[PDB]
Amino acid sequence: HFLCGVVEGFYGRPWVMEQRKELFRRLQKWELNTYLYAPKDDYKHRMFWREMYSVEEAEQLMTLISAAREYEIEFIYAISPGLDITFSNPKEVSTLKRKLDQVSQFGCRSFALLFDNIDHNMCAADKEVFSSFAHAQVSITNEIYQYLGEPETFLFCPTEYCGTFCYPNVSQSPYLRTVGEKLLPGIEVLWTGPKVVSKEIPVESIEEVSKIIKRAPVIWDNIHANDYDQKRLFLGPYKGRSTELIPRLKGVLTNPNCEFEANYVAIHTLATWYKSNLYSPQMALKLALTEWLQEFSVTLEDLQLLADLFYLPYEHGPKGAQMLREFQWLRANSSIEEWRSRAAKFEEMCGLVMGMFTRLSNCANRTILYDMYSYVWDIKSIMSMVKSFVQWLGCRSHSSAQFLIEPWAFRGGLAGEFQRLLP
Amino acid sequence: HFLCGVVEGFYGRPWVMEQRKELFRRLQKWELNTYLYAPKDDYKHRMFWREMYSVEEAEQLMTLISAAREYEIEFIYAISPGLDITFSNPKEVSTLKRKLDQVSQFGCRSFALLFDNIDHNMCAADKEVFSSFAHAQVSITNEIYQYLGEPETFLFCPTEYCGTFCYPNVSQSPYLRTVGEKLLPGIEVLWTGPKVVSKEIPVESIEEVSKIIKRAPVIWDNIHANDYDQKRLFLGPYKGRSTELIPRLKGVLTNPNCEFEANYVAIHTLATWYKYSPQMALKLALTEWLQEFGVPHQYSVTLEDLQLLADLFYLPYEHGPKGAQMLREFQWLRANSSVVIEEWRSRAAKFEEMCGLVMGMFTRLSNCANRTILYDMYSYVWDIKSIMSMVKSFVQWLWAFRGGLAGEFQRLLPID
Amino acid sequence: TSTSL
Ligand SMILES: *[C@@H]1O[C@H](CO)[C@@H](O)[C@H](O)[C@H]1NC(C)=O
Ligand SMILES: *[C@@H]1O[C@H](CO)[C@@H](O)[C@H](O)[C@H]1NC(C)=O
């Protein structure tokens, strides 16, 4: 029973129940099976993990777990005690069970314990009862695994959860060594690629990992995550993941953009590649965008451009990269006559962005507009300044009026000023 | 009477009904009176302005107008049709009245017509019927005024709604002269000052504008508006407007940050000004705000933190002192990295503690019970936190696709 | 690093 779908596992405003219904309905339209609930800043998941859901909070979770069954999406509930749990103290252990008990009674069969991003050493109390840090986590993870009547799916996210993060390397890591050998065969292990946000997942890297973990690990995929850069959004295709991986993995859960409606392409393209076990990113994209266009006035070309302007954490799209070379060329070669020719076609490429913004803002699906509004606005106003600059470079053989004739000319606020001082 | 309150008048996601109602509570609590409903991207306000409210929308809107009255806050309903409306066509004009009427039966008794940020020239059909651009708008505004029974509050917003937007200057403008002379004595005129986002609104500029429109304007203030930059938020005090503007004005309506919860300082201090020292009003506003951040209740964020937040996200032309200071200190360190007397080590230390306090601010803000406030400010506080972290460690050394595509063009512009 | 503290 191979696990594929979404983890809502980012920092920030989490999604609301209504968005997660529409999420389930979408996972089913496209044949995915799983949803891991793990949003970092829903306070009871992490910051106040010992605290029980209030009465109305409970009503919400149950109505959520319901619509999960109603759509036959499997619902895994995560908890993150990492920050401040004392592993050796039995009152601590017991609060975790009491909490996991409460959610069990909401309808929840599937569970997860995450331990990403915690201060790597322990308290004075813990360093006695336990040999190493990795000992403590596995002891509690196992203990818990038992208690719940050893549930069907059950995930464990290690502190060392990607290649970069392994000390000193993947292969001969005390932490990783301990996990593979001590942590129960019925417990899955989440893994994130070579890096936190992996450009690509080599088949040799995962085979490598399966070495020390003694399992086919579950991928927490950070490819379309945007919680770490305010300006950034990711409407590109699922890519850099070999089709040959499906055999070798227990699953992939995609950790996608915070803006819910932006995640169409991210989930669709995950879904097409779930099938097929090459697979073609360029084509999956073409499919997703044509199907996506049905929801929205805007042309397919607009969406093609939009996805190109916000593509992937390591790659711009065709039209976006082309605009970049073109402006780079133009700025470089100032002053027989290809410049005027190329500045004219570039001034037109900019206008197509203005066009895409106009059509999006006149569109009928307002939930989609609002989620992306500030992203499209930023790009349009930048191109508009870029266009206006190319004109300035050109109308310069007959003027020496400098490039300013209003605070949207000097961007970024304080953060922007600090950034321009770093190399 | 003099109008002081908020205009929901920005591009982007509009506030929801449960947020607007909360706005009403706070306007009353702080003894403000007015709310101008103008959200640019709430369709049916501008884009599909012709289209009338559904059965369910009608219920929502009415409930809201009720709550305005319940809270002794004047509700002014604005409509922005001037995008593609044909002025002479009576099909459009009758479609306008019918739109206005429908909200009237929602309980609404005050109105506005907005003609801001729209092409200077008309179609040929209207180039016939009307002499200049001004003439066209005045004509239709006046009609809808009478059509509705010449109501107590009626607002009109020019296309030349600020100093720089006037042809060729304010005093001698064709357009302003036609509005001033021919727009009905009972309608009020919106004005944002010298610029779209006026750093100051000096008295003389208001004397200059009042002369040509022959009335005292209503200030649509963009001092705290943040719709125009992804990375900007303004939590500084109402500043740059002399209290002697009040005799010379019919109102100030503030057009504040998009994130609802970030508007606490911006609205509190405008109120404070309405009854002035920006620094003292910030202290008053931050002190009261602190009470809205709790620790969550458990069955198993300080004033200094707020001040650091405000100073980091302050006003559109000025950083708060703590912000400005860190920026000063970092510049001095970066300059004298060659020097590794070593007063530098002593100063790098106090800088690293300053950076420390930014992290601390974020950690505590993320524990607080009021998650509406946390969510609204998250991505801003996160951003400053990540940068100060990298600044801290680069200071100690003595992101290629950062900002995405937009960022990459922005680094090629030279104004940066 | 994703995060901490
Ligand atoms: C670390 O980083 C990702 C992307 O910023 C964030 O969403 C996630 O919550 C953190 N943990 C894991 C296992 O990815
Ligand atoms: C122009 O600028 C402000 C800030 O961008 C925008 O919110 C407002 O809707 C526009 N109109 C007016 C009258 O300011």
Residue numbers in the entry:
A (entry chain C): 59 to 335, 373 to 391, 552 to 590, 604 to 673, 677 to 694
B (entry chain A): 59 to 333, 374 to 398, 553 to 592, 604 to 661, 679 to 696
C (entry chain D): 40 to 44
The study reports:
OGA is the unique enzyme responsible for O-GlcNAc hydrolysis from a large number of cytoplasmic and nuclear proteins. Recently, our group and others have independently identified crystallizable constructs of OGA that comprise the catalytic domain and stalk domain, and published the apo form structures and enzyme complexes with active site inhibitors. Exploiting our previously reported construct of OGAcryst (residues 60–704 with the unstructured insert residues 401–552 replaced by a glycine–serine (GS) linker), we solved the structures of a mutant OGAcryst-D175N (catalytically impaired but retaining the ability to bind substrate) in apo form and in complex with each of four synthetic glycopeptides.
In the substrate complexes, all the glycopeptides were bound in the OGA substrate-binding cleft. Particularly, the GlcNAc moieties were anchored by the same set of OGA residues in the catalytic pocket, displaying nearly identical binding conformations regardless of the glycosylated residues or the flanking peptide sequences. Consistent with the O-GlcNAc hydrolysis mechanism, the catalytic residue D174 was optimally positioned to make a hydrogen bond with the N-acetyl group of GlcNAc in all the complexed structures. The N175 mutant side chain played an important role in anchoring the glycosylated hydroxyl of serine or threonine and stabilizing the OGA substrate complexes. In addition to these common features, peptide specific interactions have also been detected. We find that OGA is able to bind peptide substrates in different directions, but in a conserved conformation regardless of the glycosylation site or flanking sequences.
